[PDB]
Amino acid sequence: MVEKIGDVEGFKVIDNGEPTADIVVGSTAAAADVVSAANVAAKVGSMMFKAPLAVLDTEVSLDAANKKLILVGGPVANALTKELADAGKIEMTVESPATLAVVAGAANGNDVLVVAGGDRAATAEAANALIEMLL
Amino acid sequence: MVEKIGDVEGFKVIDNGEPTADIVVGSTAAAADVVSAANVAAKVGSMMFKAPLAVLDTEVSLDAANKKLILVGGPVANALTKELADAGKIEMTVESPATLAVVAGAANGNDVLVVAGGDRAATAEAANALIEMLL
């Protein structure tokens, strides 16, 4: 199910005990993808030996990010994921499976982790896979 | 802003290092309320010295809950919050402020913490107040 594109295992969400990424939720999306986001945020907090960890895709841009971005939701869900799709950084449709996709430096030099699939279910599977990998 | 109804300070979300509540997200709602939910889940995870901590309001009922429920979203957002509103346990409208409302035993004997306000902003304020209180 879960396609690991890029070096996902190398994507660090914690450095010491301080989070290295925002969790960007699709504002134009289902409450499911962001249930995923909440579970991911729970995982990160668990690993947190500042600011809202979770934000909306209307409150962050790739060009202005000062840290890594975990995009939760596909192009139909997350505006930033769509921006990445409208630029060939990611190719994702309704037919796309659960996907953890690292785009290097897509956010103002900082790496991006797209956690998304074709539908809500696939996004949730990808989030769950990320949680399993973080342990 | 944040109305503390009931004994909110006494609402324990962690017992030792294992979460005592679900975080129930309004499926029929804004991605903002559940950005709140994700931030709350981050807080809980931080305090976590099993299952998805965050769920949707379509995946849990009050009558079947086996633990505390943190409802995120007002009656317009969270189906369980509406059920509580359609029963006088909570009274919440567009005019309602940011609110942390403990309903004792509303979920099959387990207590419920409504984290919600009149609009998205108020829900987020209530979530932030809960986070500050948990520390």
Author numbering:
A (entry chain A), B (entry chain A): 23 to 71, 492 to 577
List passages from the publication reporting this PDB structure.
Cell surface layers (S-layers) form symmetrical lattices on many bacterial and archaeal cells, playing essential roles such as facilitating cell adhesion, evading the immune system, and protecting against environmental stress. The S-layer is built from one or more (glyco)-protein subunits, S-layer proteins (SLPs), that self-assemble into a highly flexible and dynamic lattice through an entropy-driven process, allowing for structural adaptation in response to changing environmental conditions. In this study, we introduce the SymProFold pipeline, which utilizes the high accuracy of AlphaFold-Multimer predictions to derive symmetrical assemblies from protein sequences, specifically focusing on two-dimensional S-layer arrays and spherical viral capsids. The predicted models were validated using available experimental data at the cellular level, and additional crystal structures were obtained to confirm the symmetry and interfaces of several SymProFold assemblies.
High-resolution experimental data confirming the proposed assemblies at the atomic level is very scarce. Based on our predicted models of Viridibacillus arvi and Methanococcus voltae, we designed constructs (see Methods section) containing only the domain responsible for the formation of either the 4-fold or 2-fold axis. H Proposed assembly of Methanococcus voltae (gray) with the 2-fold symmetry axis of the anchoring region is shown in orange. Aligning the crystal structures with the SymProFold models revealed a great similarity, with RMSD values of 0.65 Å for V. arvi and 1.38 Å for M. voltae, further confirming our predicted assemblies. The SymProFold prediction of S-layers from P. abyssi, M. voltae, T. camini, T. thioreducens, and M. vannielii, even though different in sequence, size, and domain structure, show an analog domain arrangement as the crystal structure of M. acetivorans SLP and reveal a dimeric anchor, which has not been described previously. For S-layers from Vibrio aerogenes, Paenibacillus naphtalenovorans, Pyrococcus abyssi, Methanococcus voltae, Thermococcus camini, Thermococcus thioreducens, and Phocaeicola vulgatus, no experimental data on the unit cell parameters, structure, or symmetry are reported.
